[PDB]
Design a binder for this molecule. Structure first.
Ligand code: MG
Length: 52
RNA sequence: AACAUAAUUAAUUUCUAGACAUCCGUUUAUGAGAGGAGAUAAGUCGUGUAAGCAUACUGGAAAGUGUGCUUGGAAU
Protein backbone atom coordinates (compact mmCIF):
# COMPACT_ATOMS: atom_id res chain seq x y z
CA UNK A 1 0.00 0.00 0.00
CA UNK A 2 2.90 2.36 0.71
CA UNK A 3 4.13 1.94 -2.88
CA UNK A 4 0.72 2.82 -4.34
CA UNK A 5 0.49 6.09 -2.40
CA UNK A 6 4.09 7.03 -3.20
CA UNK A 7 3.49 6.59 -6.93
CA UNK A 8 0.37 8.76 -6.79
CA UNK A 9 2.23 11.64 -5.12
CA UNK A 10 5.13 11.33 -7.57
CA UNK A 11 2.66 11.67 -10.45
CA UNK A 12 0.69 14.42 -8.64
CA UNK A 13 -2.42 12.24 -8.72
CA UNK A 14 -5.12 12.10 -6.03
CA UNK A 15 -5.09 9.32 -3.44
CA UNK A 16 -8.25 7.56 -2.31
CA UNK A 17 -9.68 7.92 1.17
CA UNK A 18 -10.08 4.14 1.22
CA UNK A 19 -6.35 3.79 0.58
CA UNK A 20 -5.29 5.82 3.63
CA UNK A 21 -8.04 4.04 5.57
CA UNK A 22 -6.57 0.63 4.74
CA UNK A 23 -3.12 1.78 5.87
CA UNK A 24 -4.22 2.91 9.34
CA UNK A 25 -6.36 -0.21 9.75
CA UNK A 26 -3.46 -2.59 9.04
CA UNK A 27 -0.97 -1.05 11.48
CA UNK A 28 0.71 -3.95 13.28
CA UNK A 29 3.68 -2.46 15.17
CA UNK A 30 5.02 0.64 16.89
CA UNK A 31 7.28 1.31 13.91
CA UNK A 32 4.30 1.10 11.55
CA UNK A 33 2.75 4.06 13.38
CA UNK A 34 5.71 6.25 12.42
CA UNK A 35 5.24 5.39 8.74
CA UNK A 36 1.47 5.92 8.98
CA UNK A 37 2.06 9.32 10.57
CA UNK A 38 4.07 10.33 7.50
CA UNK A 39 1.30 9.18 5.17
CA UNK A 40 -1.38 10.97 7.19
CA UNK A 41 0.71 14.11 6.71
CA UNK A 42 0.93 13.45 2.96
CA UNK A 43 -2.82 12.86 2.73
CA UNK A 44 -3.55 16.16 4.49
CA UNK A 45 -1.43 17.94 1.86
CA UNK A 46 -3.18 16.27 -1.08
CA UNK A 47 -6.26 17.07 -3.20
CA UNK A 48 -8.51 14.70 -1.21
CA UNK A 49 -7.61 15.96 2.27
CA UNK A 50 -11.24 16.82 3.02
CA UNK A 51 -12.34 13.20 2.51
CA UNK A 52 -10.48 11.74 5.51
C1' A B 1 0.57 11.15 -28.50
C1' A B 2 -4.20 12.18 -26.07
C1' C B 3 -4.87 7.88 -20.65
C1' A B 4 -6.46 7.44 -16.18
C1' U B 5 -7.17 9.02 -10.78
C1' A B 6 -11.04 10.07 -8.00
C1' A B 7 -16.06 10.94 -6.34
C1' U B 8 -21.01 11.07 1.48
C1' U B 9 -17.79 19.45 0.33
C1' A B 10 -15.39 18.07 -4.57
C1' A B 11 -11.43 18.00 -7.54
C1' U B 12 -6.72 16.46 -9.53
C1' U B 13 -3.72 14.93 -13.72
C1' U B 14 -4.24 14.80 -18.87
C1' C B 15 -4.96 18.89 -22.54
C1' U B 16 1.62 15.29 -26.35
C1' A B 17 6.12 14.97 -28.78
C1' G B 18 8.46 14.99 -33.04
C1' A B 19 10.24 18.30 -37.69
C1' C B 20 11.98 22.44 -40.58
C1' A B 21 17.94 20.96 -41.12
C1' U B 22 16.93 24.47 -45.81
C1' C B 23 16.08 24.53 -50.93
C1' C B 24 16.17 23.68 -55.96
C1' G B 25 16.21 27.63 -58.78
C1' U B 26 15.74 33.17 -59.12
C1' U B 27 17.12 38.37 -59.76
C1' U B 28 20.99 42.91 -59.30
C1' A B 29 25.88 44.24 -59.91
C1' U B 30 31.59 44.44 -59.94
C1' G B 31 33.02 43.39 -66.16
C1' A B 32 38.59 40.85 -68.93
C1' G B 33 37.26 41.41 -74.03
C1' A B 34 34.70 43.83 -78.52
C1' G B 35 31.90 47.04 -80.85
C1' G B 36 27.94 50.88 -81.51
C1' A B 37 26.01 55.96 -81.32
C1' G B 38 27.53 61.02 -79.93
C1' A B 39 30.48 65.52 -78.29
C1' U B 40 34.68 68.85 -79.24
C1' A B 41 36.23 70.64 -85.06
C1' A B 42 40.32 72.19 -88.39
C1' G B 43 42.00 68.01 -91.49
C1' U B 44 41.71 63.62 -95.82
C1' C B 45 41.36 62.94 -101.58
C1' G B 46 37.45 62.58 -104.15
C1' U B 47 32.61 64.33 -105.90
C1' G B 48 27.24 65.40 -115.88
C1' U B 49 25.19 57.61 -116.14
C1' A B 50 17.49 61.07 -113.88
C1' A B 51 16.23 59.93 -108.57
C1' G B 52 14.32 56.74 -105.15
C1' C B 53 12.35 51.65 -103.14
C1' A B 54 13.22 46.20 -102.38
C1' U B 55 16.90 42.62 -103.24
C1' A B 56 21.54 40.29 -104.99
C1' C B 57 26.62 40.40 -106.28
C1' U B 58 31.09 43.46 -106.40
C1' G B 59 33.22 47.44 -104.16
C1' G B 60 38.64 48.56 -98.28
C1' A B 61 33.51 50.15 -98.96
C1' A B 62 30.25 57.69 -100.78
C1' A B 63 29.80 53.43 -104.70
C1' G B 64 29.12 50.28 -109.45
C1' U B 65 26.06 46.52 -111.87
C1' G B 66 21.87 43.10 -112.56
C1' U B 67 16.16 42.31 -111.77
C1' G B 68 11.24 44.23 -110.84
C1' C B 69 8.53 48.44 -108.96
C1' U B 70 7.42 53.89 -108.15
C1' U B 71 7.36 59.52 -110.14
C1' G B 72 8.46 62.20 -105.18
C1' G B 73 12.24 63.29 -113.08
C1' A B 74 12.19 64.88 -118.16
C1' A B 75 9.35 63.68 -122.48
C1' U B 76 5.04 66.18 -129.19
MG1 MG C 1 19.39 49.43 -103.61
Amino acid sequence: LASLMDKAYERKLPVSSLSISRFVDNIASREDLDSAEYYLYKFRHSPNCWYL
